[PDB]
Design a protein around this ligand. Structure first.
Ligand SMILES: Nc1ncnc2c1ncn2[C@@H]1O[C@H](COP(=O)(O)OP(=O)(O)OP(=O)(O)O)[C@@H](O)[C@H]1O
Ligand SMILES: Nc1ncnc2c1ncn2[C@@H]1O[C@H](COP(=O)(O)OP(=O)(O)OP(=O)(O)O)[C@@H](O)[C@H]1O
Ligand SMILES: Nc1ncnc2c1ncn2[C@@H]1O[C@H](COP(=O)(O)OP(=O)(O)OP(=O)(O)O)[C@@H](O)[C@H]1O
Ligand SMILES: [Mg+2]
Ligand SMILES: [Mg+2]
Ligand SMILES: [Mg+2]
Lengths: 545, 545, 545
């Protein structure tokens, strides 16, 4: 607390200090050849090469430095929390693009750097190699994202390929044995669960399996206001429409407050003739994006309802009690048995969501909105699998669980969005291409030249695409010959890289080195934003009021 | 705590230091091109360009320095809290005018600077372009005050323009979805609320809806002194005048203390024949400027009463029980159903307040006295709308709620008081107008020249009106040609600026760049005083006694 | 707390600093000639030469230095916890191999050094001399591991050799006398113990001896979820199948939570007719690697059961109550009386585990997978013995107990995995052999030369195998002649060392100086990993988040 207000040269000096320091730490771990980072936590030592673990746990002494560090880190951290294996690439570009912005000052040049890089992103978005579960490149992506795990990459891509038709939902648990072990189900993970522990079998939050139910989906949150309409709706359903009904009745909703749960507890005891072996016949279920409830409505053949008063106005046309098989739970509910008739309804709805995605724009296909609709698809069409991951020690078990989870994340987002050739090649093909497109285009060559090429940003941006390919293979066999390396036309057609596991040289395509499309795009997208913010900030305020 | 008394050279040296530091930090965030500010708060980083959020959160290490900072910050902070988008302009002029005051010392010159700038405020006040909700310039103000929000400016201007007759009262909630959602009501927000939670339906502070009531507005604050007269008045109303009475009875007042609420609770229990389904038939209501209660009286057809003893001396002439529809609440009460007979009374009372604003002086029209009276008009004639603002994250939703809030505040005060051409032009036109008006006027040129032109103040002030235009457009396409820029007669007739979003050059009128009149006027008003205060201070005291 | 982020030159310097200080301290204790280390602990002084004790309790002032010290110390400490006598070796090589990694930089050389040393490991693994309990080398191993204890080594070797057939399980107690005293039993230590103290005789955790029982092994952890099925299973067993039953019933499992134990307390009280002299007839037993319960199932003739619901569906074909003799206990249970009919079942299961080890790989034979399976064999076939260790003080008794425990750990892992000739010789033979093997082989001598010999790695790695032999005998009778020492053919065929206890010179085989194979292997394996880690670290982080 010497100076709480830092403006101008000093500010940009500290920004540049923190960036370059964070850059040298995190990039050192990149690739399988990356060098290590030892981290302190109290009385132990987590020694690692995982870039996400380095990025997250770097800390600074000065509040002003740490203020900048959080701006560089929380974008890269946030990539893996949604993607899987692509954090270090984000920080690299943040550094490279920041260095660019400062090379070309004046806030027309800045707007030209934004526009050019956004057009490079579009080339990557179009480059996306779409892939099916049959494909052996899935193994290659998983082999890439696992730091060469012969055993692991083989399991997951087999597990996806062996379910050629339905997209698997995988969960992980700490295993007891040395060997791993799999637990396949024909079950669908559903996002609903108990409102109160009383509504389970045994009356204490147990896992209630059922062989028949009659579901209803409400949109509104239920609190002290709704207590009248529940008694109206429930006694209407059991008194009038008891003929076409399979117990128990599920009331699926957004939220159930403690006032509403106590009322529905009394409604179960009101009709004790329907209580078979202790099981309550009425269960309220909660879910923590209103379309995720429409899925739940569609899965269980339940009607969609907007108000709690709508339960009175119902008929056999809208009420349909399923004779399937459900497992209600405290964390989540699981549907197992689905008749061919019910799966027919769910696939037709699943095509409808895929038909919205088919016609989305190119950049819209990599949006949050798009990834949220693909989440809904996996909920509907997707079997449940539970892998108990093993190892020699407990610490290898827990370490291996993380490397399983990174792979699962990558394979899913690979076939979802796309795949690209790795080794920092796809980035170089993209930049060098986007320059050649607008320049070769005689229509806009006039102005395209005057902004980018004429100014010299094009050639700067071309040198920066190299960074990754330099970081990986500078000081290896590939770079020993011919001083540095000639990025000529002959390379651009058939791009040579080195596999750092085996040692051999060839194309990324031939050697089997692939990145996920969503990573290297979202790295660049976030890399630009965070490079801009750093480059365009001129003031730091340390005063907690 | 070295020195607790600072006089003279040392005192002004700190003021100049603090004013220059706060200037550089805040004015860097001006315009859409504006550079950013990172702010610490514990373990997070709010990075922003909003000059308010910067201004408010600047802190200084030395107590002496922070003493002066509070004086420079609180006026600019206090502009947004009543206007919406007009804070950075305040600090700019506070700097600019401080420099003017010190350039011309001696307390005859000081008096002259005030008078000249005060006449410049009048020329701004007369430049105010009055605008209807119909007008497409409302979009242009909203667009400007939103930093180019195509979606937001369109929505709020559509919402005002679709209600061409009744001025909307908007509120904002944290929305769940990606999309926004709109909740239009035919309701008027009223400032009364429950004294005690016992008086609602269910006896715990709930939202009691009613379809009939008989209100009585009291002026005085109620405490232990008034417990006798309530029992006199209440039993007089129920025993004698029960025939012309619709329950419940509303006792609206300034403040109900805990002694009086315990008495009225017993008065409800005293007559249990009138308690219809729990609802207490007597409710005391509180409000946190006595004419706001006169509005509440006119809305509910209740008689205005000075003393609590007046409740006995009443008749069927003074008492009038409404059969409308009211919703009593803990934060505020709302009236929805109003019979065309009632809105005939309310509109006539609304015109009567507009009668006072028509004939007010020009400088009186921008006062607090004026704006408070306009607050009354919106309480009387105004529908209620509640927008649940959405987005991708929680932080974007809360970020976007403020940008909604700032646009609403602007649009309201735009049509309320006026609209001016932005881009720091209007200020130049104002100063170059005021100097020429007094100079060209044959009657007062003899003395006008001797004060302002001969002493050199006019030329100083002419240069300072440029400050805003220079900060925005220096280092751009507009200032590149011909060194600096020529503010000649050719410019004053048709003033050129640069739209910083698009990059094209033109008039503020032609490009659609508009500041609110109340902002740029209250920026100057506040600029002068605060500049005066800083320039006319020669002693700082730090001692907590 | 000056800097929390150490990168590059600074990082490697501290690693080298710490390694070379930890090397100097621990290696000085090596062999019987080793020099001493005094260690503080509050208000006393443990003065020692046992390398494990040195390494573990070395600390550093700077957090950065202690960060690295944990990485050097935790591997060698973790050798003796499983192996017995082999920590200083591990550190010695960690130093040596680190040195090598730095001499040959560039990460193709790093992969070469690994592959070469990995083949040196294989040659040691093949050099492993397998040994029977009858053999007099077991004494020679013990003699080495005890720093020459004539009285101790003789006992433990005599103890294993007198039980020529069954592998003795040894435990230790602090004795009262000067002399040692032994307590032989025909008892088998079993890993089950009381869930709750209520289930023992006297109802407070006592040692309940039984002469008849009927055991049942459950796989799952038992908590509040399983309380229904236990009452279903227990009353099914006692009501239906009471004829073929010997009390008490033992419910062996993974874990019994306090909800399940309170249920079984009521089930004993439910049938008081079967309570003979206080003893509860139903005991739940817990165990803190799923195949160890299959051993417990086989030892007691109990059926293996996955679910708790399986107890209902049972028959005389699956149920068999033993009429042996068991001793239940708080820490562990003990089986004494086993009929020849039972031991036939247990020996056949033991051979079945051994037939898995017959068919393992050479490198897999030294795995934790292998060592866990061999732990199962000793539990099955293995008589119990308890030695109360004596001495002249309390401190010598406790000192001597550790040296017993090292010899037991060594002798067990010697005959388990193998024996090698000590005096640092087998390391020199292995390295000098592995070089000559690949070189001599005309098939691969083309490339083997190009990688290892031509580069100079071979000659460096050969020099480093000397390290151990140099540190023992440099500055002795063996090294005084001929300046340094010639490691020619003549030596390799008959490798001369010195017995530092006597003084005389001869072969390690002849003098009787033998290392445990598992030690000098797992030292090298660990030395390579930890050298690599140290040599490939270029970032230290001290930030406590
Ligand atoms: N065998 C290989 N040969 C060459 N390059 C490889 C190989 N495996 C991975 N890469 C490259 O290394 C880069 C990925 O590095 P790495 O996985 O260490 O960091 P990241 O994916 O950016 O972030 P994270 O720490 O989340 O994994 C990719 O550009 C990829 O092409
Ligand atoms: N597209 C544009 N082109 C040119 N000038 C613009 C544009 N948009 C806004 N401005 C100018 O920016 C100034 C307003 O600055 P800004 O909105 O950053 O701060 P403020 O309104 O003083 O306070 P606050 O921080 O509360 O918004 C006005 O003078 C206006 O003319
Ligand atoms: N009488 C002896 N003559 C020659 N060498 C010996 C003799 N006794 C032991 N050694 C050698 O000394 C080495 C063992 O030393 P030491 O027991 O101090 O190391 P360590 O086993 O790694 O440490 P710790 O026993 O604390 O785990 C072996 O190489 C062994 O061959
Ligand atoms: Mg990874
Ligand atoms: Mg604003
Ligand atoms: Mg020892």
């Amino acid at each position: 607390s010497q100076t709480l207000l830092v403006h101008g040269k000093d500010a940009q000096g500290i920004i540049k200090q923190v960036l370059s320091e964070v850059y040298d730490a995190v990039t050192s771990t990149m690739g399988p050849n990356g060098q290590l980072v030892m981290i302190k936590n109290g009385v132990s030592t987590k020694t690692t090469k995982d870039g996400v673990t380095v990025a997250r746990s770097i800390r600074f002494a000065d509040e002003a430095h740490e203020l900048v560090n959080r701006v560089i880190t929380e974008p890269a951290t946030k990539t893996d929390e949604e993607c899987g294996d692509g954090t270090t690439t984000t920080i690299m570009l943040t550094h490279a693009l920041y260095h660019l912005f400062k090379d070309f000052p004046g806030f027309q040049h800045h707007r030209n750097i934004e526009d050019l890089v956004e057009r490079v992103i579009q080339r990557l978005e179009s480059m996306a190699i779409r892939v099916e579960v049959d494909d052996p490149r899935l193994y290659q992506v998983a082999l890439t994202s696992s730091n060469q795990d012969e055993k692991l990459a083989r399991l997951v891509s087999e597990l996806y390929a062996n379910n050629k038709g339905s997209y698997p939902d995988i969960e992980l648990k700490e295993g007891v044995n040395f060997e791993d072990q799999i637990e396949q189900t024909t079950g669908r993970t559903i996002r609903m669960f108990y409102a109160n522990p009383w509504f389970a079998k045994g009356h204490q939050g147990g896992v209630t399996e059922l062989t028949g139910f009659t579901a209803f989906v409400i949109d509104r949150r239920i609190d002290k206001e709704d207590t009248q309409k529940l008694i109206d709706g429930v006694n209407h359903l059991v008194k009038t429409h008891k003929q076409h009904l399979a117990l128990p009745i599920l009331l699926i909703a957004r939220s159930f407050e403690e006032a509403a749960n106590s009322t529905l507890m009394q409604l179960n005891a009101a009709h004790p003739t329907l209580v078979e072996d202790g099981r309550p016949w009425l269960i309220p279920l909660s879910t923590p994006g209103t379309s995720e409830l429409q899925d739940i409505a569609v899965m269980l053949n339940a009607p969609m309802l907007s108000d709690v008063a709508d339960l009175t106005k119902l008929d056999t046309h809208s009420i349909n009690g399923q004779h399937g098989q459900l497992e209600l739970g405290g964390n989540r509910s699981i549907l197992k048995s689905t008749t061919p008739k019910d799966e027919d309804r769910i696939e037709q709805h699943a095509r409808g969501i895929e038909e919205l995605l088919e016609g989305f724009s190119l950049s819209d296909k990599f949006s949050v909105r798009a990834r949220y609709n693909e989440r809904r698809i996996r909920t509907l069409r997707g079997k449940l699998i539970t892998i108990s991951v093993g190892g020699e020690t407990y610490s290898e078990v827990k370490e291996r669980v993380d490397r399983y989870e990174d792979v699962v994340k990558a394979i899913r987002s690979a076939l979802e969005n796309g795949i690209l050739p790795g080794g920092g090649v796809s980035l170089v093909k993209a930049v060098f291409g986007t320059i050649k497109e607008g320049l070769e285009d005689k229509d806009q060559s006039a102005e395209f030249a005057k902004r980018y090429i004429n100014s010299g940003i094009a050639n700067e941006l071309m040198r920066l695409s190299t960074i990754q390919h330099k970081l990986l293979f500078k000081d290896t066999a590939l770079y020993k010959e011919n001083g540095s390396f000639h990025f000529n036309d002959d390379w651009l057609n058939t791009p040579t890289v080195m596999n750092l596991a085996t040692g051999e040289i060839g194309t990324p395509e031939g050697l089997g080195i692939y990145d996920t499309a969503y990573a290297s795009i979202t790295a660049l997208k976030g890399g630009l934003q965070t490079a801009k913010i750093l480059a365009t900030t001129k003031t730091l305020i340390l005063g907690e009021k």
